[PDB]
Amino acid sequence: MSALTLKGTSYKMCTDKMSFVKNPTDTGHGTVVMQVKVPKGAPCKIPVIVADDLTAAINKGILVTVNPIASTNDDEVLIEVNPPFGDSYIIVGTGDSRLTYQWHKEGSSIGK
């Protein structure tokens, strides 16, 4: 939700081929912890989104740590995210270059 900084407000997009160096994992502390990479051509404030739609038409979840910036185009980094209760797809990137990872939090379609 745009009630906090990094959600649809403004960023210099990454559009070169991103990846997870570590998939998101539910900490039980209210957070989902991942590692991500950018490879070349990309000065960017790395677009971290959370959706129900695989494309970030919805803009559900919050950045728990700082939203980082690729100042070397190969930059890779620790990020934590926070969905609300229930379903999500964590999304890393913009362009065809973006990836996603499915996560459900307790209380909608499953109990954990």
Short mmCIF file of C-alpha atoms in Angstrom, two decimals:
data_model
loop_
_atom_site.label_atom_id
_atom_site.label_comp_id
_atom_site.label_asym_id
_atom_site.label_seq_id
_atom_site.Cartn_x
_atom_site.Cartn_y
_atom_site.Cartn_z
CA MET A 1 0.00 0.00 0.00
CA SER A 2 1.22 3.59 -0.83
CA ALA A 3 0.74 4.56 2.87
CA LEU A 4 4.54 3.82 3.06
CA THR A 5 7.37 5.03 0.79
CA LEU A 6 8.12 2.28 -1.79
CA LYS A 7 4.70 1.57 -3.37
CA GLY A 8 3.84 3.25 -6.74
CA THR A 9 5.29 6.63 -5.51
CA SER A 10 8.52 6.98 -7.62
CA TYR A 11 11.61 4.91 -8.59
CA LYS A 12 14.21 4.62 -11.40
CA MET A 13 13.20 1.11 -12.63
CA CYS A 14 15.43 -1.95 -13.18
CA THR A 15 14.65 -3.66 -16.55
CA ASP A 16 17.73 -5.91 -17.05
CA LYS A 17 17.26 -9.61 -16.05
CA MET A 18 16.87 -9.84 -12.24
CA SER A 19 17.02 -12.94 -9.99
CA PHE A 20 16.65 -14.18 -6.41
CA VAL A 21 20.02 -15.26 -4.91
CA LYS A 22 17.74 -16.55 -2.06
CA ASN A 23 13.95 -17.04 -2.34
CA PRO A 24 11.65 -15.18 0.15
CA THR A 25 11.03 -17.16 3.41
CA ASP A 26 8.39 -16.30 6.08
CA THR A 27 10.28 -15.38 9.31
CA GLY A 28 7.16 -15.69 11.53
CA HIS A 29 8.25 -12.18 12.79
CA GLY A 30 5.71 -10.65 10.29
CA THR A 31 8.31 -10.61 7.44
CA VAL A 32 9.50 -12.56 4.36
CA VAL A 33 13.33 -12.51 3.85
CA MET A 34 15.09 -12.73 0.41
CA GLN A 35 18.34 -11.95 -1.49
CA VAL A 36 18.14 -10.45 -5.05
CA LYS A 37 20.58 -9.54 -7.92
CA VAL A 38 20.76 -7.14 -10.91
CA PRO A 39 23.51 -7.99 -13.57
CA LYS A 40 24.32 -5.18 -16.13
CA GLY A 41 23.19 -1.87 -17.77
CA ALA A 42 21.01 -0.89 -14.76
CA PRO A 43 21.28 2.21 -12.54
CA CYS A 44 18.04 1.67 -10.51
CA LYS A 45 16.09 1.90 -7.19
CA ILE A 46 15.27 -1.78 -7.31
CA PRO A 47 11.46 -2.30 -7.85
CA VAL A 48 10.09 -4.61 -5.11
CA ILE A 49 6.34 -5.28 -5.42
CA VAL A 50 3.82 -7.75 -3.90
CA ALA A 51 0.61 -8.69 -5.73
CA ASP A 52 -2.31 -11.16 -6.20
CA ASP A 53 -2.06 -11.00 -10.04
CA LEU A 54 1.58 -12.01 -10.99
CA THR A 55 2.20 -8.50 -12.59
CA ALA A 56 1.73 -5.99 -9.67
CA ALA A 57 -1.65 -4.59 -10.75
CA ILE A 58 -2.30 -4.84 -6.98
CA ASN A 59 0.46 -3.22 -4.81
CA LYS A 60 -0.12 -5.09 -1.54
CA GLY A 61 3.04 -5.45 0.55
CA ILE A 62 5.53 -3.21 2.37
CA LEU A 63 9.37 -2.97 2.33
CA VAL A 64 10.55 -4.00 5.86
CA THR A 65 14.19 -2.93 5.28
CA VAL A 66 15.48 -0.07 3.05
CA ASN A 67 14.63 -0.24 -0.69
CA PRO A 68 18.17 -0.49 -2.22
CA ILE A 69 19.79 1.15 -5.29
CA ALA A 70 21.97 -0.60 -7.92
CA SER A 71 24.99 1.79 -8.01
CA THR A 72 27.08 -1.01 -9.58
CA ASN A 73 25.01 -2.73 -12.29
CA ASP A 74 25.91 -6.22 -10.85
CA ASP A 75 24.64 -5.23 -7.31
CA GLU A 76 23.05 -7.98 -5.15
CA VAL A 77 21.33 -7.36 -1.83
CA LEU A 78 19.32 -8.53 1.24
CA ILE A 79 15.63 -7.44 1.26
CA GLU A 80 12.72 -8.18 3.65
CA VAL A 81 9.04 -7.68 2.69
CA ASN A 82 5.71 -7.67 4.59
CA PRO A 83 2.39 -8.77 3.00
CA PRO A 84 -0.83 -8.50 5.08
CA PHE A 85 -2.60 -11.73 6.17
CA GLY A 86 -3.56 -14.10 3.31
CA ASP A 87 -2.31 -14.72 -0.26
CA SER A 88 0.51 -13.05 -2.31
CA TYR A 89 3.03 -13.25 -5.15
CA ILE A 90 6.30 -11.46 -4.25
CA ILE A 91 7.56 -9.68 -7.45
CA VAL A 92 11.16 -8.57 -8.16
CA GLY A 93 11.60 -6.26 -11.16
CA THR A 94 10.03 -4.56 -14.20
CA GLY A 95 10.04 -5.59 -17.90
CA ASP A 96 10.20 -9.27 -19.06
CA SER A 97 13.33 -9.22 -16.80
CA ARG A 98 11.15 -9.50 -13.61
CA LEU A 99 10.58 -12.67 -11.50
CA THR A 100 7.97 -13.71 -8.90
CA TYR A 101 7.67 -16.15 -5.94
CA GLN A 102 4.33 -17.38 -4.45
CA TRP A 103 3.67 -16.80 -0.69
CA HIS A 104 0.52 -17.35 1.39
CA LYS A 105 0.31 -15.95 4.95
CA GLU A 106 -2.07 -17.55 7.50
CA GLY A 107 -5.82 -16.77 7.29
CA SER A 108 -7.31 -16.88 3.70
CA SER A 109 -6.72 -19.93 1.41
CA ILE A 110 -4.46 -21.85 3.88
CA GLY A 111 -3.80 -21.88 7.67
CA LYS A 112 0.02 -21.21 7.40
#
